[model samples]
Target chain A: DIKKILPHRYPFLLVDKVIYMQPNKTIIGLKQVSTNEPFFNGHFPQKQIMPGVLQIEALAQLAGILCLKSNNLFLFAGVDGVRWKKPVLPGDTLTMQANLISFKSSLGIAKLSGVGYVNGKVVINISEMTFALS
Target chain B: KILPHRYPFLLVDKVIYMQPNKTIIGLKQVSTNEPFFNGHFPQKQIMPGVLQIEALAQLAGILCLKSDDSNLFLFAGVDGVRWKKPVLPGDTLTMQANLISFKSSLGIAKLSGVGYVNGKVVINISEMTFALS
Candidate 1:
């Protein structure tokens, strides 16, 4: 279950489901963006689009689930490059994939790259992401 | 008045300074009663990095609306995001966003953002691209 793996709760837990996972290698997930989302109300009263940072959060959460073990917690460290190609609107399903780059368990560091798609087209790209194990 | 963000989501508490479309400074009073703190961590509470970016972007949004209709600003890209310190409850988050350029024809605004706490740098964003709609 997502709740079991991720410590994040409501309004903060962005990942909706994990569809595929190759332990310590890769993970695929989905977030169903909705108009009912609380952030949409003030993100833009005139227009509604999924915030780019939340997209990164979604990818990071997926990556966290892939590398973290029971009783282990991974904190977000940093993000290098992020690009949003298209606006993620309400009712859109964000399909994401994260691939592990390296994991220095001894050093408590993990790095990964991620991408998000809508209708089979690329919508988001994260060049590199770093996490610290706590 | 330009921002639509409400409680539990609105991070910017007040706009302290502004130079039209050039620059903007704002602040958020972090409190222990915050809802995200409950989920960001059930045990030890620390503000999320993404929310920091949101706060900066929201401040930039106000600057982008200095003399225009209520056009929506959306993030097109972000680069060089680095978190240097952990933000805790009772800390006042001071954020600044400087406009690099705004192309009226393209409806895009590029800005650089930095956040500080007690004069110490906490977060740095080299560039943030916003698409106006």
Candidate 2:
């Protein structure tokens, strides 16, 4: 199901499963980062800590899956007030949640706000994200 | 010689254009040999949007550190980033990172940039910030 909605596949495809979802409102996905991950092989080859950008992308991918289930072709429009609170590392299970805040079908635009958690703590927080739905 | 990032993670291949701190241009030749392609998509090997942003960020980082390459630059944040089209294998991605402003005291730089393939805008951003640490 994730593969069908998310245009992502192995490697780039971060979400391993959808733990929870409420249609077009809210969705949660899980990703377990591991040392075996391809990006880690080159990101450091020494003490590998996941790139902050990729952590953000993982959050966006959750939203992408949600949009797909809503029956819209999702395109990333923008992200605002993004803060990386912590580093995501190998063996860490990322709990990504995206909340649909607004969707204007007429304007073909949507907005989502989300946070990433690990061990019951916030690691990433995004104030808002706008997407163009076609 | 503007960054410490190496192969695989090193997204920018060449600096074809630069104007001090004002702007910088770079290119990346997407290849089938790219390891990411091995798993990015089994059906269609489209380049990930996140990588597109990273390529642009690397160009901006080089511009900020072109004069002093020893320091590392950290991505502070990005905004209004959009992907207009898909980039596939063998596509030559040309990126331009334009300086919107820089604060020397804080070592933070603001930039607006875009990625083009075949003279068409495939990716763009209203603003991105970097902090040299």
Candidate 3:
């Protein structure tokens, strides 16, 4: 089901699968960052911390995928109030969750959040984010 | 009709005025369908922060072009950038570049750039710099 929705492939594709999805209400996506990613090769070479922007990109992509499933052509209209809680690194698995807060016709709004956990410990928590689709 | 910069690397669209080592005003408009936005977030299209910084840099590029006597202004480096807000689609950003100091062939400018929706600051940031040819 996840494979059918997302068109991203290989290294650029962040999400691995979906544990749960509820149309326009809520959705959860997974991504496992491996050491062999293209960016890690040159980002640092030794001490690689997944670029902060990419983390936000992952969240945006996940939210975007969910938005598309709900509507015919859901384009990412805008982003507001984004904060990075922690750094994502190689060999780390990330869980991205998004909830549709409200919608008006084609302009849908959602609160997207992400948490990176390793061995049952929360490493990062993104609390608030807003996006519009048309 | 002021400065002569071609496409591709030319960041600033136009410069209104310059207060000589004080402030410089510039403008940039993002279309609803930009080439980068298609891949930036294909599902939910939002402008990336890195590109936002690039826009800011483009604004700064104009400042460098105006302040110095060089025909070609090149980006040497970026320092102390803080992203205070987010810029969305259909937003026209008005950038104000304030010069901090200038010496030799290098100059430092503090830019206050904002994206406006009927005259409201959507994204703002303070940046330091070194300009070269």
- The reply for model 3, stretches above 4 Å from the true place, is A1-11, A40-43, A106-124, B1-133
- In model 2 chain A, the worst 10-residue window by lDDT is A1-10
Candidate 3, pairs of clashing residues: A76-B44, A76-B45
Cα lDDT tens digits, model 2, B39-117, are: 5447677787777877888888788777453566678777777788889989999999998887779877788999999
Tens-digit per-residue lDDT, B27-68, candidate 1: 999998765565433666778888888788778777877845
Best by DockQ: 1
The segments of candidate 1 whose C-alpha lies over 4 angstroms from its true place after superposition are A2-5, A9-11, A34-49, A69-72, A105-107, B3-8, B33-41, B67-72, B103-107
Ranking by TM-score: 2, 1, 3
Model 1 pairs whose backbones collide = A42-B4, A42-B5
Give the higher-TM-score candidate: 2 or 3. Answer: 2
Order the numbered candidates by DockQ, best leading. Answer: 1, 2, 3
lDDT of 2 by residue, A8-109 (tens): 432666778989999879999998888887665444556567676777777887887787777557667677767666667778999999999888888998
Model 2 TM-score, all chains together: 0.85
Q: What is the Å distance of residue A19 in model 1 from its true position?
A: 1.5
Cα error of candidate 1 at position B7, Å: 11
Interface RMSD of each: 4.4, 3.2, 10.1
How does residue B90 of candidate 1 score in lDDT? 93
Over the full model, what C-alpha lDDT does candidate 2 score relative to the true structure? 0.78
TM-score of 3: 0.50
